[model samples]
Target: MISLIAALAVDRVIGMENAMPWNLPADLAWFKRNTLNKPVIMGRHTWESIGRPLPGRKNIILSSQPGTDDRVTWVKSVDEAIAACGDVPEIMVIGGGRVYEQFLPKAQKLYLTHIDAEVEGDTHFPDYEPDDWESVFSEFHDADAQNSHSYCFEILERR
Candidate 1:
């Protein structure tokens, strides 16, 4: 199954200047828990933003640039990346913006964290048709001393 994972603000903003606008430790931990053992596909910019291969997961980068690393599998397209995963049951598309757009149509599920506040950003999640999906799970978290924003984790499946 192809699962897309993202954390977005109320306004649907996902990133600003190549990074997440908010620092929500809870959401970060949530992401790590969900994607820990899965194969993750991401764009070149998303890979660059991370700065290193995420430990305990297969890092696949979609890029036309010529390069190779022991830590990452560099591919020319999304299909190539997906094919590289072989029999992995769940492949996580961890994104910037364009990468998410490319896989949105084929994604079987969405793992999203909706932040409570609107924020300024240069990158935004693609607008998805609500009627086409059904929410299968949701959990809300309140803002606290450690977490700067109140958010809800939602798992949606394509209907």
Candidate 2:
């Protein structure tokens, strides 16, 4: 199955300074939990921002130029990235703007964490039609000492 995962602000802002505009550990944990042991596909910038391969998962990076290490697989196209994952039941498209936009149309499921606060950001998740998706799971989380803002974890399946 094809899937996309992201934590975006209310206005769909996803990045600032090459990272999430806010720090929210619970959401990070939530992201990890959903992606663990699965093949994760991302663009070159997303891999650079992450700084290293995620330890428990297959990290497939779409970089047109070259490869850096033995742990991660590098491909030049979206179709190649999908093929790199082999026979997995699901592959996650973790993003840094454009990558999400590229995968949005192809993804059947969305693991979305919607942050309530608005922060200054130049990057945004692509606009998607709400009518095309239906919630499979959803949970609201209030702000806490670690999480700076309230957010909702929602798993949406494309209708």
Candidate 3:
């Protein structure tokens, strides 16, 4: 499955200047659990934000000058990225805005986290019509010592 996994503020803020605007470990854990072993496709900016290749999963980055090494594989286009993943059952697109915008239409599943707070950011997740998807799972997580804001986790399948 081609999936988009992201955590965005209620206002749709995703990146502030090139980094995550919020500090939520729950999302990090969730991201790890779901993306573990699955190949991840990310834009160069996202790759830069992450600093290095994620362990366990294959790291594929879309770039003009791909430059893949032993740790990460780089491709020039979305089709190439998908192709690089080979026959994986699920492929995840974790992005820095532009990458998400390009793959949003091709994605068949969504793992979204809606943060309930006002935030500042320069980049935003692409807009999607709710009527186009069916929520298969939904859960609310309240703020705690580890999390600073309440959030809703939702899994939606494209209709």
Residue 84 lDDT, candidate 3, scale 0-100: 98
- Cα lDDT, all candidates: 0.92, 0.92, 0.92
For residue 158, give model 2's deviation from the true position in Å: 0.7
**lDDT per residue (tens digit) for residues 36-110 in model 1:** 999999999988898999999999999999756767898998779899988989999999799999999999999
Question: What TM value does model 1 have?
Answer: 0.97
lDDT of 2 by residue, 25-100 (tens): 9999998998999999999888888998898999999988988877899999999999999999999999979899
Off by over 4 Å in 3: none
Output the lDDT of residue 113, model 2: 95
Q: lDDT of candidate 2 vs native?
A: 0.92
Could you report the Cα RMSD, in angstroms, for every candidate shown? 0.9, 1.0, 1.1
Candidate 1 stretches greater than 4 Å from native: none
Mark the 10 consecutive residues where model 3 has the least summed lDDT. Answer: 65-74
Query: TM-score of each candidate?
Result: 0.97, 0.96, 0.96
Give per-residue lDDT, candidate 3, residue 123. Answer: 88
**Candidate 1: worst-modelled 10 consecutive residues by lDDT:** 65-74
